[PDB]
């Protein structure tokens, strides 16, 4: 029937294109009085809206007056609620003041807003925060409607989530601040995530106070709900670049994108419930003097174009098509993803560093660490799928494993792992207090100067611009001439572990393998430091290990547990880690690793990096405070 699209937004869009929208939107001959109109509220005052409503009601009892604006205002929401309670008309809130979610709505009111509710916003922001492993949050509410329900939902989400969440004191902004009783509260806030549940002007004032009192840093990530960013044409300058704005709509989902959907839902409800009420457009005569089978609460189940646009008891889209965007550098909303009805469809899974949020931020303390798959080091595992999250002890590693060889798609799953390097980076970030970007990319193995072929994590850390790497490998020639390793925290060197009568590597059975010790599988892992060391020391032994090259570390362990592998030459730490879990203590380390190579594990740093001194001091403090025995007892668990 008649679709009164009262667009009260400030933009003067051509309303002539709205009359011809009946064709593609279910053009049926059942509605007779299809009086499609469109107005443009210029003056932003309740009086103009009241006059427009009273004029439209006199126009042959116009029913179903869909209203929408461009800026969310608390006055327009209350006015539309009063209109829907008095006139009892199924209004459809599209955007602006028509979509301002309130705390407690009227039961008889048919205010059907489009977008996400406060609980849905809390859920999606909790998902976004847990996808980046951010548990230190600070909730700040205000006097606007929707604070008690919001804090209740937050407390409920924290209770069921058993992965740890720093619940700091909630700051209330119900009263006006005078910079005498709120600065002390804002100073105590030390969490990274800053939940700012306020309005536009209040958020601007909070950002101004943070910039004037020295609260804006490279670690404070402000998050605002859809109430703050309720528009796509006005962006203040106080908000820095990187403000996560979870808005229910953007420039893609403009007014015209929802007008057609609302008209389709309305005409579908009319065609469905027309057999009950013949005269559907029955409203009051005018504004002077003036639910059984109407169309008031019978349009909360129309599924338009497959979208789950069902309304709740108060009226709100249960599964909206909200788009989560952030703030770019040139005062524009840069899209990073959206949220589907099933789960969170985060397009930009890699969170940017954002070393400079605002213009006056010269501090750059964002680093990056690269790690690979190693047997003696942290074992690569998967994230716990019982809650799609993990714990703080398991640092989420950004994996890069592909599905197939011919395919180019790389799964950037946020899997968490625990181990030696994980604890190293944890204690480093706890003592040195720096930010890192850890990622586990599928690479090769240890690279060296063989035909200038650099692969694996070694090839990555050889070049500059790389901060550091948790992988502390054996000391070599090229890996020490290219980059400057830190102090070796361990003294384990290269030795041999035969799976009794031998004297290590000084036995005469290696120089002449013809009579004694016939040539067997004596090779090490392909492209390893031991190969280079032997080639530099013994050419014939290197040729023998090359012509008898074995498989990886796991196959070497399987062969050692079987008995076919004679000897396994590697670092003493790896040999001790392997012997710590022997299946009967069969293989024994013949000679420790201090008479053959006497190497160590040095952190792969950058040549001429300012963080080298800090890493060296951190290592000397960690191995110079009396916890070396504790580390040896915790990591090395050799019982045999």
């Amino acid at each position: 029937l008649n679709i009164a699209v009262l667009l009260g937004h400030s933009h003067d869009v051509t309303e002539r294109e709205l009359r011809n929208l009946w064709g593609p939107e279910q053009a049926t001959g059942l509605p007779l009085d299809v009086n499609v109109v469109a107005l443009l509220m210029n003056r932003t005052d309740p009086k103009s809206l009241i006059t427009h409503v009273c004029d439209l009601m006199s126009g042959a009892r116009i029913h179903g007056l869909v209203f929408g604006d461009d800026t969310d205002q608390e006055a327009v929401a209350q006015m539309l609620d009063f209109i829907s309670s008095q006139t009892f008309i199924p209004i459809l809130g599209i955007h602006g003041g028509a979509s301002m979610i309130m705390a407690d709505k009227d039961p008889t009111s048919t205010f059907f807003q489009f977008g996400a509710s406060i609980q849905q916003q809390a859920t999606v922001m909790l998902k976004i925060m847990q996808d980046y492993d951010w548990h230190v949050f600070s909730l700040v509410t205000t006097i606007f409607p929707g604070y008690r329900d919001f804090i209740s939902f937050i407390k409920t989400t924290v209770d069921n989530s058993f992965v740890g969440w720093d619940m700091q004191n909630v700051i209330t902004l119900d009263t006006s601040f005078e910079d005498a009783k709120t600065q002390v509260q804002l100073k105590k806030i030390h969490s990274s995530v800053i939940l700012l549940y306020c309005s536009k002007d209040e958020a601007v004032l909070i950002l101004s106070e943070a910039r004037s009192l020295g609260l804006t840093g490279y670690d404070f990530f402000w998050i605002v709900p859809s109430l703050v960013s309720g528009n796509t044409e006005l962006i203040p300058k106080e908000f820095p670049s990187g403000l996560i704005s979870v808005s229910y709509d953007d420039w893609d989902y403009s007014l015209e994108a929802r007008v057609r959907d609302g008209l389709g839902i309305l005409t579908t409800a009319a065609s469905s419930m027309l057999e009950k009420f013949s005269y559907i457009p029955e409203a009051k005569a005018s504004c002077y003097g003036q639910p059984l089978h109407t169309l008031h609460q019978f349009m909360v189940n129309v599924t338009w174009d497959g979208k789950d646009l069902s309304f709740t008891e108060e009226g709100y889209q249960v599964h909206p098509r909200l788009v989560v965007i952030v703030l770019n550098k040139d005062r524009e909303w840069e899209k990073v993803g959206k949220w589907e009805n099933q789960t969170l469809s985060l397009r930009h899974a890699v969170w940017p560093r954002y070393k400079s949020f605002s213009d006056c931020e010269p501090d750059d303390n964002h680093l990056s660490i690269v790690t690979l798959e190693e047997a003696p080091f942290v074992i690569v595992e998967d994230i716990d799928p019982l809650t799609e999250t993990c714990v703080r002890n398991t640092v989420p590693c950004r994996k890069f494993v592909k599905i197939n060889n011919s395919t180019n798609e790389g799964m950037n799953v946020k899997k968490c792992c625990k181990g030696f390097c994980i604890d190293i980076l944890k204690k480093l970030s706890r003592t040195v207090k720096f930010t890192y970007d850890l990622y586990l990319v599928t690479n090769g193995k240890h690279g060296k100067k063989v035909n200038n072929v650099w692969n694996g994590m070694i090839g990555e850390v050889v070049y500059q611009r790389a901060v550091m790497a948790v992988g502390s490998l054996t000391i070599n020639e090229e890996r020490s001439e290219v980059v400057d390793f830190s102090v070796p925290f361990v003294e384990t060197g290269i030795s041999v572990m035969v799976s009794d009568q031998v004297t290590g590597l000084s036995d005469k059975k290696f120089q002449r393998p013809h009579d004694y010790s016939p040539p067997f599988r004596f090779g090490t892992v392909p492209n390893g430091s031991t190969e280079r060391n032997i080639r530099n020391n013994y050419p014939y032994m290197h040729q023998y290990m090359t012509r008898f090259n074995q498989r990886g570390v796991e196959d070497a362990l399987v062969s050692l547990k079987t008995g076919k592998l004679d000897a396994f030459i590697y670092d003493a730490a790896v040999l001790n880690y392997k012997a710590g879990r022997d299946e009967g203590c069969k293989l024994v380390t013949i000679g420790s690793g201090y008479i053959f190579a006497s190497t160590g594990y040095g952190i792969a740093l950058q040549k001429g990096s300012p963080w080298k001194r800090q890493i060296d001091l951190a290592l000397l403090q960690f191995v110079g405070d009396g916890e070396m025995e504790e580390l040896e007892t915790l990591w090395l668990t050799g019982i045999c």
Partner: antibody
Amino acid sequence: QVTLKESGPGILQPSQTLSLTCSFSGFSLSSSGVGVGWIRQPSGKGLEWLAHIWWDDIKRYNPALKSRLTISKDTSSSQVFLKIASVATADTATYYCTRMETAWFPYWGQGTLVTVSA
Amino acid sequence: DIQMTQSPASLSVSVGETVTITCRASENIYSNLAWYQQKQGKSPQLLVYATTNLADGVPSRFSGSGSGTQYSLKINSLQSEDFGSYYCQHFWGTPWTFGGGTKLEIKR
């Protein structure tokens, strides 16, 4: 096979933002290796390296141009859109997006003409 | 940044003579240097990468050697298909500065 194509506004006024686009097909940008990197060469001078993005979607700009150089890519449409604001007559160069990998040979594209003038 | 001081472009070598592109280096000593060749209007094609191996479609006369700060590009047989400006771009440090440009011509 590996194909490259450079597009963008040929004539544009200075002190604005370009609309460079490095379209390609056959490969990707987050496929454990081959990526993309912007390279420009002014008239009468050598080439210049501004910035590039790796496979793990990491950004790293140039210290001398750390005011407007913002590199961005997309894995859904396989496009590389570069945003450079506050341009002038000195930035007039033929931008290239070639390979920056340690493979056998880096592949190069034709290139587009970008004449910045009022 | 690594100051790359390539040989001047006024280096004319006749057909048959050897070419020694003397692209010097700076205080920052590196080990890998990728040579390129930019023709008239075409794109710079990588000839020798890391100064140790050849690329696909590169003749065998283009040989690279040198260590420390002195890196040269030995050209055994100079032919007509070797026309174009040569650059010594290094991927070792963070600033990937290019060379001055080696313009080879016939001095007859």
